[model samples]
Target: VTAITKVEREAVLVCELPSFDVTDVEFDLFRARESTDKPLDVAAAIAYRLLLGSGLPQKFGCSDEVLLNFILQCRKKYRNVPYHNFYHVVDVCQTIHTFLYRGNVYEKLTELECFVLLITALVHDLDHMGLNNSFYLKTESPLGILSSASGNTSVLEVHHCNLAVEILSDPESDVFDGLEGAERTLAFRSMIDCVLATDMAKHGSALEAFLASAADQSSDEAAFHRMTMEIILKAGDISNVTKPFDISRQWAMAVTEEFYRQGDMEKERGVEVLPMFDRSKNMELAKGQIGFIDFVAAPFFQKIVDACLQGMQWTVDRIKSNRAQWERVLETR
Candidate 1:
């Protein structure tokens, strides 16, 4: 085992969960953030508690101390940018846990597969600089140029996967260290595949593949598992719209600010900004969110839940609930 310095361990120790119960559908992490003096630590603690609550660590030979060290590394790797920071990934972790347990998705997948999903959720957006993949390509940023040269269109996704691999490389911090032979390979491939599938550039193709596999699910066990895990991770990524209205609104606002910042930078650099990101539009949040839920979030969850993840009907229900909330906003305005 790698030696975890006292400071490293305490960095995660600073994080604490207000409760351990994962069954609460209405649990408010936004409120939890308010109660804690150290927000990152609170996020870390929530993830730690949830993972322990899953009992996967002990099942796979990961000690609490090593897990904490892994989390500490992940927490620090995330950039302090709006919307895609450490808190965002931590939020993903928590959301996916609910999908797995509360939503009963764990019933379909192997324990080892579920373990990788949870861990991948924690690092899916590692070291995000707030900007999305489109921003990098439009600006022809160095990383973007490298992505072009390497022929990997999903710039930020590949980067995140790279960083995740780097972290998992350490036997001491490797949560999958207990796996042998093919199992280890499956864990790494599935985790990285899920991470890569998060890119919006590949959204339609990925969803199509997932939907197709989900259709004749019994015929291809391996494909079904991969696609389901990918879709679950994607669902967790966009889960904000499936949460309470206030929580959903808060996330929308954060992303809007980040979009506005990207627009501001694009303007400064004479780059073309998408209308949604354009500060000139002063796009109404209510209308934007409503449109998102209709064209994007609503159809996405509705279809996916209809296919393989019937247990996650709550997400579609929450999307409808959120749409009504946004409609009220526009009506009042």
Candidate 2:
């Protein structure tokens, strides 16, 4: 089991603020107010090392300062949401890095692709509003309107990708300033493509693609590995379902609170409150929580394992272990 150790805790704390750099002041304030332990920073540092070690620096031709700044920006943007905030980004990055490096897969990816994939993981949900697309759809918000018009259930994801690019384009940000014009363009496009590919709406299509590729008897090991990485990433995106029961419960509660907060805003606007999001009443939180886990999370990861052999097996094992722990927690409750 991958437990958080004391050394890991110290690494996390140190990574959170790094040096006394001016860019880190905002991070320090954010961390202080949150009052979390060093686990988060350790997680982020693990992500940083993995991405850098995967050859991202060679592709971007930038110092660690630039990458650190980019990550800090992501942290600042999503400070309000607890589980889905910067720490979640760190978790996803670490998870992806683990899958890539655990079995010599890292050596297979080109320097450019490695950089693009890691950057995609880092900025995928930049400026997340702590609300799901379903909430917007239920309320007929402007975002919902946009989604309806586009016939793309992933419109919210597209917005996120566009916003991240806008953040990078800021001259003063200097996060991507070291890149040449063509290299910057390519990196931006690749990252955006990968991020959009992560939308929950595309799950069915993604699963189908994986299944088809896996069934292709002519496919070589290298091709299969590439396919596995993509599915692993998708699984990681919705991995809360497979997390330990306590951890999964924590994520569910945080999301429920965020939804309730949105419901409050809708109430002030004189709109009818969404059913599950209304905090004034009980919402059968545990049942709905378990249902989401069983229906969505389990099936998704199962599909991933069905598609890939090597790394997918490891992820499946991890998810199953987490699920077993959660089951024990439920039994005790």
Candidate 3:
């Protein structure tokens, strides 16, 4: 049995390990039948079950309770933090899982790649401080120094991700004691590559390069699969753009509120406020979001569809349907 810190142990005790009897299980089953609506928890269970069922080798044989606890701890650490938090991480995991399973992309990827992607989703935002790269850059924080010296934020994200894995693999942590040798090494490398590739700044250039590569090898199925993987991952990262309108609007509001909170912090610290970083009360919020969706997300996904028509078409249709739902809600409002 692995030991947890006192705080973590207490959290686990409270959040998991319910004293369920027959009636409790009966109630849960009944609710589940009506709808599998437990969002983050449901998503985590699905990801775990999928990985296990898919026959991917893993070092940690974590139970759903333990995994949920780990995820909740991450959420607690970064709750209401911009671009981090358990929700965002779980959402990404769910999105990636949906694409992989729903579109039958599982047959397309190796077990190693699938494991890599799942672990990347799990730790992509570990220890995130809710501050953007520009925040650290302007403040001369240690991360800024590191990013500046490295010449890119992706390098910094990779460093943090590697640190996270080290923490998980610690002798005291014992999270990875089940496996050794090449299996551990392969899992670690795949996670590093996938997480490091998630930097939004690299998205445009990476997509362009992928497009160029695909064009150069139009007849190659292998080339198409590789290209589609990058695009799908990119799409999952910014999935808010393709969300149903109401959900998208809710996320935009939450994000805007977070920006406002940051502005308040800046005001107290006497830092100059950056434009559009604190636009909670702006009347044109919806318009601005739609424009962002069009200019940024749509074009990127469009290129993805162009390279792999079938998969990309399905993604586009889902996004469009979501947008239509949102437009209806907007009219009602």
Candidate 4:
């Protein structure tokens, strides 16, 4: 596939997004996507603008052209899935930006750490195939066999890390080209850790360890930094349930469609699709969000904000509001 031309790259501007402040916790990426008319370009523009605004590119010797090219490559790798597409990653990126800055979490880490967190959020879901890890393992697909042999159950997360490295292999598009020796290795490791931790399989342990760190952040600087990155990425991954009522519902619809598509594939492959994903049941999607918020999302954001992310109370508040909306769905039933 041909790369994005420099002129084409420059023509797309997402820096001064008018719908909301880029730093706003409630930044409307859906609006930005509509305004640009090209999801790929808009995604790239969002990454470029965020990285540029952070000033990390200049400090780390990254150039404007290479950054755009890297984003273009990342954008290309994302499959045209409803949930795990380029728009999803860009949304993750923007959300994490709010977590670090508006949430006042940036002060706890070095500039390099903050930089990696933002960039990793942009590519953590790179090239997802619109299927979960369970789908691969249950079918005993070739990739599943390899995943078992490798003893790494996070099938998609590992694949995303490998693809991220592939994107960075070309110096012309390597955003971390300036780092040398230990810093380079740290960037790569921390990024991979954060991405891998995004897998739902690791969610419990990562969250527990993060809360542990929060309780005792007075010790082990590096460990706390790493935990924060992982937990924040996890937060971003599940943040749809914590957004405004309408935005949260829209994302739920998109993901429900994606899950049903996977169910269609699973049926053909003779795999056991979860009931929530099985479209034939006519699943109460809103009720599922209610369960999701009640059991998973609400507690996660609440604990995190209670621990160290005070500025992110809006997330917990929104979660409550969304839960009430979903409850209305249950009541209508």
Best candidate (score: TM-score)? 1
lDDT of 3 by residue, 113-203 (tens): 5655655676777766666555666667787788788777564476557555655654453234444798667556656555666777777
The positional error of residue 297 in candidate 4, measured at the CA in angstroms, is 0.5
Relative to the true structure, how large is the alpha-carbon lDDT of every model?
A: 0.86, 0.61, 0.57, 0.85
lDDT for each residue of candidate 2 in 187-274, tens digit (9 for 90 to 100): 6666666677787778788778767878887868654544545665675577655444555566677778877887787777676676
lDDT of 2 at 24: 17
Residues 1-333, model 1: lDDT tens digits: 245578767866766564645446666778878876787777778888889989998898888887887887788788878899887888888899999998899998999999999999988998888788888899999999999999998999999999989888887678888888999999999999999999987878888888888788365898888888998899999899998999898899999988888898989989988999888898899999988898888888988889878889999998988898788888888
Error of 4 at 313 (Å): 1.2
* Candidate 3: residue 239 Cα off by (Å): 0.8
Q: What's the TM-score of each model vs. the native?
A: 0.96, 0.72, 0.73, 0.95
Sorted by lDDT (best first), the order is 1, 4, 2, 3
Question: Of the pair 1 and 4, which is ahead by TM-score?
Answer: 1
Please list all clashing residue pairs in model 1, or write none if there are none. 15-41
Model 2 global lDDT (CA atoms, 0 to 1): 0.61
For model 3, what is the alpha-carbon lDDT of residue 107?
A: 63
Q: TM-score of model 2 relative to the true fold?
A: 0.72
Which is superior by lDDT, 1 or 2?
Answer: 1
